[PDB]
């Protein structure tokens, strides 16, 4: 069995898991002044810290001053590509692209920043469709995005070039705060942390809304017929939300992976380490993710013993 939070990993946020060759690699917001830690597991339950996968102080890097957030790693063209964001010398948060021959690094910058529009961007997520076309989903961050008086984080999407170095065409708005559960009467509003999966020919974008430092941080999804949208939010959002009666606060900024035997999906998400006084100290959790009647569902959030991720 497992009991959340799995691995006892605290002082993090934004857990991204990649499965590769029967091992799992977790990358997270961690060393915020410097880079990103990686943890390894054979089973999604037992985790071992394996150092900085991306270190801005590594001799081949050097980019970014602070605010190293939300790394994601894909295996594409027979190597590993990491996206992340950090604050540049000009004060704007920007997305960067790095690569490595190994999931444990060292990752080396290949285009840092990946793009630059004089504004703040975070939470890049690269989705490779079944036909091999890459798409990047990313956040135009509330810090520098004010629309009709609201500081608002919006998720955009663009198709990428095959080499991942260019974002094609104009940015396409995917989603922005719009549903009642997303704090649409607040001065600051968020849709962030996109993660896209495909199921039965449709595309499902999981995302987080409300403030990361509130118990009300929570996960919803939207559905599209094509990766560039239109993206239509699930009416029953959020699909993963707090259970303060279980000490579960602010479930958010998730990734998705599969069990060791390939038979079932898990959502990997953070919650506040200290629900009595929430903030940036978050911890890693997993729970079962599945589709039923065309609805994406989570069995959770749990904090009691659950059957281990299915394995042979
Ligand atoms: Na992410």
Residue numbers in the entry: 4 to 315
Q: What does the primary publication say about this deposited structure?
A:
Based on primary and tertiary structure, the H. orenii glycosidase is a member of family 43 of inverting glycoside hydrolases, with accession No. cl14647 and sequence cluster cd08772 (superfamily GH43_62_32_68) in the Conserved Domains Database (CDD). The enzyme folds as a five-bladed β-propeller similar to those described for inverting GH43 enzymes of clan GH-F. Each blade is composed of a four-stranded antiparallel β-sheet repeated five times from the N-terminus to the C-terminus: blade 1, residues 14–59; blade 2, residues 69–120; blade 3, residues 125–179; blade 4, residues 190–244; blade 5, residues 255–306. The conserved catalytic nucleophile is placed on blade 4 (Glu195), the catalytic base (Asp17) on blade 1 and Asp126 on blade 3. The enzyme displays activity with pNP-αAraf as a substrate, but no detectable activity on pNP-αXyl or pNP-βXyl, which suggests that it is an α-1,5-l-arabinofuranosidase and not an α- or β-xylosidase.
The crystal structure of the H. orenii glycosidase was determined by molecular replacement and refined at 1.10 Å resolution. The deposited model includes riding H atoms, and the asymmetric unit contains two protein molecules (molecule A, residues 4–315; molecule B, residues 3–315), three HEPES molecules (one associated with molecule A and two with molecule B), one sodium ion per protein molecule and 1032 water molecules. As inferred from homology to related GH43 enzymes, the catalytic −1 subsite is situated at the bottom of a pocket formed at the ‘top’ of the β-propeller. On one side of the −1 subsite, Trp72 (blade 2) forms a conserved sugar-binding platform. In the present structure, the piperazine ring of the HEPES buffer molecule is wedged between Trp72 and Tyr215 in subsite −1, but does not form a planar stacking interaction with the aromatic rings. A metal-binding site is situated at the central axis of the propeller, immediately below the −1 subsite. The metal ion present in the structure is represented by a 20σ peak in the σA-weighted difference Fourier map with coordination to five ligands: Glu75 O∊2 (2.1 Å) and four water O atoms. The imidazole group of the nearby His256 (blade 5) is positioned as a possible sixth ligand, but is 2.8 Å from the metal ion. Thus, based on the composition of the crystallization medium, the observed coordination number and the metal–ligand coordination distances for the bound metal, we modelled the metal ion as Na+. The metal-binding site in the H. orenii GH43 glycosidase is strategically positioned at the propeller axis to provide stabilizing interactions between blade 2 (Glu75) and blade 5 (His256) across the axis, which probably explains the increase in melting temperature in the presence of divalent cations.
